[PDB]
């Protein structure tokens, strides 16, 4: 699974003393985060599960 | 390949273990985040 966003952390000193980490800017490969699954592997294992069922 | 793409969403305000009455703010993690893991079982309902 991947989140292709080289984003920054514009931390803001909303004290007193204590600090808050806000979201800076979002740059890079602006794509939606997603997961990669080996399809044949899933199909194969799922089948093995169905056998039990 | 073949392979499957699963659309995901990101949240920063979350509630643990179905517990209401409090919430936790995740700080944004700087830079590109990517990881890999082993799926070792299913939680299924009939």
């Amino acid at each position: 699974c991947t989140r292709p966003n080289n984003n920054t952390r514009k931390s803001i000193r909303i004290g007193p003393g204590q600090a808050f980490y806000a979201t800076g800017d979002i740059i890079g490969d602006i794509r939606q985060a997603h997961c990669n699954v080996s399809k044949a592997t899933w199909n194969e294992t799922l089948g093995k599960v169905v056998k039990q069922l | 390949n073949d392979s499957i793409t699963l659309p995901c969403r990101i949240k920063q305000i979350i509630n643990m273990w179905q517990r209401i009455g409090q919430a936790m703010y995740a700080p944004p993690i700087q830079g590109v985040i990517r990881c890999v893991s082993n799926i070792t079982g299913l939680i299924l309902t009939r």
Partner: antibody
Framework: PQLQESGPTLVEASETLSLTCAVSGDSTAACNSFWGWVRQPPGKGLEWVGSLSHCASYWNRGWTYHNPSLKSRLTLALDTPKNLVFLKLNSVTAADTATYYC?????????????????????WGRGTLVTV | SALTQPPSASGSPGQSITISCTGTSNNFVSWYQQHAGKAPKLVIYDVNKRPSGVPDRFSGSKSGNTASLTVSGLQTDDEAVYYCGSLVGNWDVIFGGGTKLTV
């Protein structure tokens, strides 16, 4: 924002050419642009040499874009604490005589889809004529 | 694949010239201005966009396989060699032959 070409003006046939651009007024290490070169032959038009950036993604250690006809003899480099751009052109022939320009590249760089797409010379140098 | 520009342009001051660039696009289209003994200057990018300082009388467009740049209200300083530019395939930066314009 000021670019400045520097290096030898005369090299020997088959010798590697090493040119350096002095960048002032901005930081080359910043994700806003690509850095590279263009070499206009005397009495002819512009020719893109190449460009690169150290603004890395999870799967690499930055981005490098070569001219497919020149790749076979070309290495590029950057110096982020001094803000310098380097041209390492291998085995230089008479056909390689040209006016070389320090180029900052604008385009769909900073925010991009699938891979960075720079498309224009954001900032120009003045040019230097290198011969053999 | 490459960009094509006719070798040269002409009209009197106060006139307007539209110059073509054949080799299609893409929104990744730009034009440059070069004077003799001078480095090229970026005139326009993203077809329609002028960077800070470029006069309001400079403007291009595109259709099909050809892009264009129109320079209106010609004067002495407008005489220069102009180049169009296009991003091709993956990252290939192409320059046209160049069109030398005279007022």
């Amino acid at each position: 924002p000021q670019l400045q070409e520097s290096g030898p003006t005369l090299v020997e046939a088959s010798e590697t050419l090493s040119l350096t651009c002095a960048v002032s007024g901005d930081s080359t290490a910043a994700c806003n642009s690509f850095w590279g070169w263009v070499r206009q032959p005397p009495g002819k038009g512009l020719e893109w040499v190449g460009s690169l950036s150290h603004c890395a993604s999870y799967w690499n250690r930055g981005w490098t874009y070569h001219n497919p006809s020149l790749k076979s003899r070309l290495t590029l480099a950057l110096d982020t604490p001094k803000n310098l751009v380097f041209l390492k052109l291998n085995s230089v022939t008479a056909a390689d005589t040209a006016t070389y320009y320090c180029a900052r590249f604008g385009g769909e760089v900073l925010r991009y889809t699938d891979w960075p797409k720079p498309a224009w010379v954001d900032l120009w140098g003045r040019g230097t004529l290198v011969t053999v | 694949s490459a960009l094509t520009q006719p070798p040269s342009a002409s009209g009197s001051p106060g006139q307007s010239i539209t110059i073509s660039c054949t080799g299609t696009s893409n929104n990744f289209v730009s034009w440059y201005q070069q004077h003799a003994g001078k480095a090229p200057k970026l005139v326009i990018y993203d077809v329609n966009k002028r960077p800070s300082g470029v006069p309001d009388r400079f403007s291009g467009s595109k259709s099909g396989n050809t892009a264009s740049l129109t320079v209106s209200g010609l004067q002495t300083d407008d005489e220069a060699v102009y180049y169009c530019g296009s991003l091709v395939g993956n990252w290939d930066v192409i320059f046209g032959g160049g069109t030398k314009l005279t007022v």
